[PDB]
């Protein structure tokens, strides 16, 4: 498998290659690295049988109970 | 205005800023003048000005965060 991230917010595609997200969706992340530099920040993922690109700032790892701090420690929320 | 880096990012181009998760980023422009550069923002990290992907930051460095769907949260 690939890592599974969770959508934080709804996202509505603006084009046909973009993946629609709704809050709480589990997204399998297939690539975090755009081939074209102008697309950096968009990740490829799969949800619901569909594969497309989505903005990385709409997803998180898990549900929020554990936080990774800037200094690399973990905390409970 | 202060933003926070969401992810580590290692740059691979000229003028691009290194990000580490949790960095404070001061955003200078949210709008590339050229169409090829749309999606990249200009800002300053650690005293250095350069560009970075917009989607690798979130707004706010204190108790209130602004999400990209236009909502606000307590951090």
Numbering used by the authors:
A (entry chain A): 42 to 118
B (entry chain B): 44 to 118
Could you pull the original sentences from the published paper?
MLK3, also known as MAP3K11, is a serine/threonine protein kinase involved in regulating the JNK, p38, and ERK pathways. It is composed of several modules: an SH3 domain, a kinase domain, tandem leucine zippers, a Cdc42/Rac interactive binding (CRIB) motif, several linker regions, and a proline-rich C-terminal tail. The SH3 domain has been implicated in the autoinhibition of the kinase domain through an intramolecular interaction via a nonconsensus single proline motif located between the leucine zipper and CRIB motif in the full-length MLK3 protein.
The newly identified binding surface is composed of an extended n-Src loop (located between β2 and β3 strands) of the MLK3 SH3 domain, which opens up to bind a peptide ligand, named “MLK3 SH3–interacting peptide” (MIP), which lacks the canonical PXXP motif. To determine the structure of the MLK3 SH3–MIP complex, we constructed a fusion protein MLK3 SH3(41–105)-MIP(1′–19′) where the prime denotes residues of the peptide. The structure of MLK3 SH3(41–105)-MIP(1′–19′) was solved to 1.2-Å resolution and refined to an Rwork/Rfree of 13.6%/15.8%. Most notably, several hydrogen bonds contact Trp-10′ in the MIP sequence. The backbone amide group of Trp-10′ interacts with Asp-74, and the carbonyl group interacts with the backbone amide of Ala-76. The Trp-10′ indole nitrogen atom hydrogen bonds with the carbonyl group of Trp-83 located on the edge of β3 strand. Gly-8′ and Arg-12′ also contribute to hydrogen bonding; the carbonyl group of Gly-8′ interacts with the hydroxyl group of Ser-72 in the SH3 domain, and the guanidine moiety of Arg-12′ forms a salt bridge with the side-chain carboxylate of Asp-80. To accommodate MIP the n-Src loop undergoes a dramatic conformational change.
